[PDB]
Amino acid sequence: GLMQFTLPVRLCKEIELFHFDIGPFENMWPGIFVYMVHRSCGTSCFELEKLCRFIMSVKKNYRRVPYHNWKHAVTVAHCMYAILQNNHTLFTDLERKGLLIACLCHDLDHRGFSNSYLQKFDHPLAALYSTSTMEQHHFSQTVSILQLEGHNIFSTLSSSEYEQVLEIIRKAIIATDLALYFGNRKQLEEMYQTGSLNLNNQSHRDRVIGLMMTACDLCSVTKLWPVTKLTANDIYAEFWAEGDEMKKLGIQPIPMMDRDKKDEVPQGQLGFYNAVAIPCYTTLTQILPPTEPLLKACRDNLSQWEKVIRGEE
């Protein structure tokens, strides 16, 4: 009970900031997650023996891919932690429990290929889950691990609290399907502007959690430019591999996934910032004003890509 996780001074201070990088020491990441769980949720939230066994099972079920790896799981969980800590009173106990676990589990068993590639390959998962293919698989993987003997971190919740938390996690993971983000933000924009947004409405909370999940999932665009730029190599490493696999199926991939078209990436990032990233962090700042540093970091990084295209770097 009295066993608190403590980080070195520099991490203890920087972990509270949105632009925190979790560092290259893999063996510190579980402790960084437990630290955030204890401060975000409480030391009572989870049995430490069960939590530690859950964390290491999740880690085992993330693959050795360039981007959709264990580091991403923890990095996304950290963004959620920063949003929850800056929005203390807005979220219930069950939501702070569920969401940190949802983020850690949101890309479980990712092979580094899009829902689109699974469909064109005719992968079994595409037959099992017609839409949001990988995300339904991520939730499936999350339930499987929870049901491993001595892994059920929610055991002390009631039947209805258990069913509520797993429903928060399912919606949260399904919302990381970027295909579902465009309509979710648009609805949230209308609701905010017409002033019909109501956080006591469960359907409206769901949409706001959805947007929070997109913002956490994209948080690599909200880091210091050195972090954002080097993470962008890992992301394009996966895109170009999928491009290669499309060519193998006899399909020219989109320029974004074509390694023969690397020159187009700077402009491709501009579109992504303008079409997805900036809108996402703007709506989020409108609903949750203390999340404004994500929008500011994201705009700084937009400018850095503009500087790449102008040949200044």
Ligand X SMILES: CC(C)(C)c1ncc(Nc2cncnc2)c(C(=O)Nc2cccc(OC(F)(F)F)c2)n1
Nearest CA-CA partner of 117 in 214, 239, 255: 239
Interface with ligand X (CB under 6 A), residue total 15
Note the Cα 262 to chain centre separation in Å: 26
Does residue number 222 form part of the binding site for ligand X (CB under 6 A)?
Answer: no
| Annotated binding residue 123 | no
Partner whose footprint covers residue 184, from Mg ion, Zn ion, ligand X, none (CB < 5 to 8 Å by kind)? none
Burial of 5 (C-beta count, 10 Å sphere; 0-12/13-18/19+) = middle
| Annotated binding residue 68 | yes
CA dihedral 53, 59, 60, 66 (to 10 degrees): 180
146 vs 213 by CB, closer to Zn ion: 213
CB of 8 to ligand X, least distance (A): 26
Of the residues 150, 183, 271, 289, which one makes contact with ligand X according to CB under 6 A: 271
Q: Give the torsion sign (CA, 297, 21, 84, 96).
A: positive
Place of tokens 């964390």: 55
Helices (H) then strands (E): counts for the chain:
15, 0
Note the Cα 37 to chain centre separation in Å: 16
Does residue number 268 form part of the binding site for ligand X (CB under 6 A)?
Answer: yes
Say how far apart CA 241 and CA 257 lie, in whole Å.
8
Q: Which of residues 144-183 bind Mg ion (CB under 5 A)?
A: 176
By beta-carbon distance, which residue lies closest to Zn ion? 107
94 vs 237 by CB, closer to ligand X: 237
Own/partner pairs for 117-120, CB < 8 Å, 24+ apart? 117/242, 117/245, 117/246, 120/246, 120/249, 120/251
Of the residues 179, 199, 275, 309, which one makes contact with ligand X according to CB under 6 A: 275
Partner whose footprint covers residue 29, from ligand X, Mg ion, Zn ion, none (CB < 5 to 8 Å by kind)? none
Q: Which of residues 100-119 bind Mg ion (CB under 5 A)?
A: 107
| Annotated binding residue 244 | no
68 is catalytic: yes
Stated as kind and residue range, the H or E segment containing 238 is helix 225-248
95 vs 217 by CB, closer to Zn ion: 217
Of the residues 276, 278, 296, 300, which one makes contact with ligand X according to CB under 6 A: 276
Burial of 90 (C-beta count, 10 Å sphere; 0-12/13-18/19+) = middle
Say how far apart CA 85 and CA 129 lie, in whole Å.
35
User: 272: which 2 tokens?
Assistant: 């992504």
Site string for ligand X, 150-189 (x = CB under 6 A): ----------------------------x-----------
Residues that bind Zn ion (CB under 5 A): 107, 217
Summarize as ranges the residues that interact with ligand X (CB under 6 A).
178, 217-218, 220-221, 228, 231-232, 235, 256, 268, 271-272, 275-276
Question: What residues make contact with Mg ion under the rule CB under 5 A?
Answer: 107, 176
List residues with catalytic annotation. 68
